[PDB]
Write a protein that binds this ligand. Sequence first.
Ligand SMILES: Cc1cc2nc3c(=O)[nH]c(=O)nc-3n(C[C@H](O)[C@H](O)[C@H](O)COP(=O)(O)OP(=O)(O)OC[C@H]3O[C@@H](n4cnc5c(N)ncnc54)[C@H](O)[C@@H]3O)c2cc1C
Ligand SMILES: Cc1cc2nc3c(=O)[nH]c(=O)nc-3n(C[C@H](O)[C@H](O)[C@H](O)COP(=O)(O)OP(=O)(O)OC[C@H]3O[C@@H](n4cnc5c(N)ncnc54)[C@H](O)[C@@H]3O)c2cc1C
Ligand SMILES: NC(=O)c1ccc[n+]([C@@H]2O[C@H](COP(=O)([O-])OP(=O)(O)OC[C@H]3O[C@@H](n4cnc5c(N)ncnc54)[C@H](OP(=O)(O)O)[C@@H]3O)[C@@H](O)[C@H]2O)c1
Ligand SMILES: NC(=O)c1ccc[n+]([C@@H]2O[C@H](COP(=O)([O-])OP(=O)(O)OC[C@H]3O[C@@H](n4cnc5c(N)ncnc54)[C@H](OP(=O)(O)O)[C@@H]3O)[C@@H](O)[C@H]2O)c1
Ligand code: NA
Ligand code: NA
Lengths: 329, 329
Amino acid sequence: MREDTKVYDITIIGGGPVGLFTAFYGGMRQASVKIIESLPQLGGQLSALYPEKYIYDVAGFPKIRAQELINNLKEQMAKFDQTICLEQAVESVEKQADGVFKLVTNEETHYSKTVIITAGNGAFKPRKLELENAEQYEGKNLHYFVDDLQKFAGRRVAILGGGDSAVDWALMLEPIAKEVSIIHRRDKFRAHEHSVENLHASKVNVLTPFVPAELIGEDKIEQLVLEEVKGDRKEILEIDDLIVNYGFVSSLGPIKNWGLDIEKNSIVVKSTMETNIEGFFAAGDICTYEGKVNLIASGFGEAPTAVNNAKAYMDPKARVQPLHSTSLF
Amino acid sequence: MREDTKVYDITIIGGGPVGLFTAFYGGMRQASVKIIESLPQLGGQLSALYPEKYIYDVAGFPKIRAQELINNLKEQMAKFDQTICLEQAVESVEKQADGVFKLVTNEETHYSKTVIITAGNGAFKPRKLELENAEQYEGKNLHYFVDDLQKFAGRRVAILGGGDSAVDWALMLEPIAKEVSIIHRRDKFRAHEHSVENLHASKVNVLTPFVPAELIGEDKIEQLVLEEVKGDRKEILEIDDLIVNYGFVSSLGPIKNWGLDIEKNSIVVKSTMETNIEGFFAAGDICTYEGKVNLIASGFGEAPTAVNNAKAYMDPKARVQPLHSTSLF
Ligand SMILES: Cc1cc2nc3c(=O)[nH]c(=O)nc-3n(C[C@H](O)[C@H](O)[C@H](O)COP(=O)(O)OP(=O)(O)OC[C@H]3O[C@@H](n4cnc5c(N)ncnc54)[C@H](O)[C@@H]3O)c2cc1C
Ligand SMILES: Cc1cc2nc3c(=O)[nH]c(=O)nc-3n(C[C@H](O)[C@H](O)[C@H](O)COP(=O)(O)OP(=O)(O)OC[C@H]3O[C@@H](n4cnc5c(N)ncnc54)[C@H](O)[C@@H]3O)c2cc1C
Ligand SMILES: NC(=O)c1ccc[n+]([C@@H]2O[C@H](COP(=O)([O-])OP(=O)(O)OC[C@H]3O[C@@H](n4cnc5c(N)ncnc54)[C@H](OP(=O)(O)O)[C@@H]3O)[C@@H](O)[C@H]2O)c1
Ligand SMILES: NC(=O)c1ccc[n+]([C@@H]2O[C@H](COP(=O)([O-])OP(=O)(O)OC[C@H]3O[C@@H](n4cnc5c(N)ncnc54)[C@H](OP(=O)(O)O)[C@@H]3O)[C@@H](O)[C@H]2O)c1
Ligand code: NA
Ligand code: NA
């Protein structure tokens, strides 16, 4: 655990499209801004689930690719400064006796005058390996997210899963690692067929249809035991690193432990976007009210409403109504 | 007075940016849509009051010219069918005994299952010439809205006003008209400095500081008499056409007589965007609620909220939540 003692004006929970636009508007209102995001990148459901698909119902865009919209939002918010904390899932939020919010994640403790939660359906997290003692190896040689390929240089690597993530990493590691195995529970892969063709074409050891049965290693994982899906046959692999790419899940989880009023598995808001905790606002798919629609356009409307009301909360002489952007730049 | 006996699903009062996106969204939800707009053009405050200016706080646009955003919205809604009624200001809205809304304008009577008012600050009207016989010439050779500039080819034109609209028309007409004069009540123009420099360098006859004194003509205007401001001098122009560019005025006007709940020139809405009259919704600058900010982004979020709740009102079996646009097309 570490601690960032700087009190930010606005801390945003979740860097999907609504959080990104919220960050922009915080900058517009001369607020210091932190974004905390569960995944190793920004973009929420758009970047995670349909980055290549076209969106037709965002105002002003006859058609726009999801990732393109996210890229536009990043460019928009780049005019201002934020501190962005990726791979952090907020698990605790408490308004302290001095009014300052304290936020705790899996990695770091943060402070803020206001919090705006833009969590969607809750934190995106990788699917964990469902083997009794898998957690023991987290922080050692069990990897869920991969960034630096060179740490696997000259090493025996096993990758679990059959999607684009598992296949892509297997192909990138083949020329770097001593040996690479990919283990998937069907003979048919879920990854793009061309990537799967290259995989079979490559020197990657493909083990299908198998599931992980056991992890062995007192300290570091040393052996991986596989079991065939149809039948009882087992295989043991000697490995230096295990990468698990089983996709992602989202849930509210600890968002329900902060004293917020929750209805429809979402955070209730007044028309100002404020929750039942003053200084704590919500926007986008995480929020609810009578007539709420879960759309990007709706969230993009909620964002400035939240930021502008947050600004008035922080500075009772600040007008909720912003000045014209046409004049300000 | 004429009557359109077709009962529309959704009829939108005002074709500013929020009414345009509302109209698009109606199409998205497979509703029959009519837009009724007071001016001879769509675009609201953007097109009328700042078409040339860059907007920076619409989600997904690092910067977009106001008129270009309007153009984008028109392209977006062109995917579906709408009935557009320009040059019609709504004077009366009544929810009849059968539940059907009856809307009466200056030109026509309309019917609708639901109404979504997107009127901003009220119906735009051009500021008119305050001379006693001026109205007599409307529909003849006195012009408040100019579309077919070619019809001024080879003609003697006088333009009234000192803003960008007047100056732009003078400069655009100079190369094709026989003669162009611009008449303004101060030696200083309100138009942009470079345009004014172009104006003085051109062959346009600039008459300042003058106001119109008299229109002469039994049928069409044949002569325009001007008088110097704070002076003792008149001028008479022989003209074929008179264009007046005195800007725009807006007010709620008869919107206050429909039995709606109104505060501070705004229609009070609950979180569903519904007014106190069931089936009658509002969005954009016209609506209010605690925390409301008059922004384009805000209005763009309110629009689909209104449409989707109007859909649920018309068919309580149909859902509020739309299917994905990524999927629908
Ligand atoms: C296949 C598909 C197609 C779609 N098509 C459309 C469409 O065409 N038009 C449209 O308008 N909508 C569409 N949607 C819905 C749209 O994706 C959502 O409305 C939008 O993603 C909501 O944005 P958001 O920022 O509120 O939430 P999200 O996109 O879910 O982002 C929230 C972010 O918050 C992070 N987060 C959450 N909790 C925490 C925490 N505790 N700590 C740290 N980080 C956290 C999450 O990891 C996530 O990155 C579609 C959805 C799907 C799945
Ligand atoms: C100079 C200026 C700069 C601005 N800069 C920004 C900016 O940078 N960013 C931002 O977000 N916002 C900005 N705004 C505010 C922005 O223009 C408004 O939020 C936006 O125009 C509201 O859109 P609308 O569709 O609700 O209303 P409007 O734009 O007012 O359109 C309403 C339309 O309804 C019509 N109408 C009204 N009543 C009737 C009736 N009874 N019958 C028929 N038609 C009717 C009117 O003629 C009008 O065309 C600015 C405003 C101004 C004046
Ligand atoms: N280059 C690219 O275009 C690229 C790169 C990375 C990610 N993506 C996209 O990002 C999204 C995420 O994909 P990603 O692979 O992380 O995740 P994914 O598509 O969800 O794939 C997860 C893989 O894990 C397997 N799995 C899950 N739980 C398991 C379990 N309990 N036991 C055994 N196997 C299990 C699944 O098996 P089953 O298939 O049998 O269900 C699947 O093969 C996808 O849309 C993907 O296309 C694209
Ligand atoms: N090319 C561009 O960039 C462009 C193009 C079109 C519009 N716009 C913008 O759109 C906005 C609207 O401009 P627009 O020119 O329609 O309108 P405008 O700026 O309001 O100008 C109206 C002109 O009419 C004059 N006027 C009004 N009533 C009068 C009266 N009774 N007698 C004499 N003169 C009268 C005003 O005089 P005074 O100046 O003395 O008040 C003013 O010069 C402006 O911000 C403009 O910059 C920009
Ligand atoms: Na929700
Ligand atoms: Na208003």
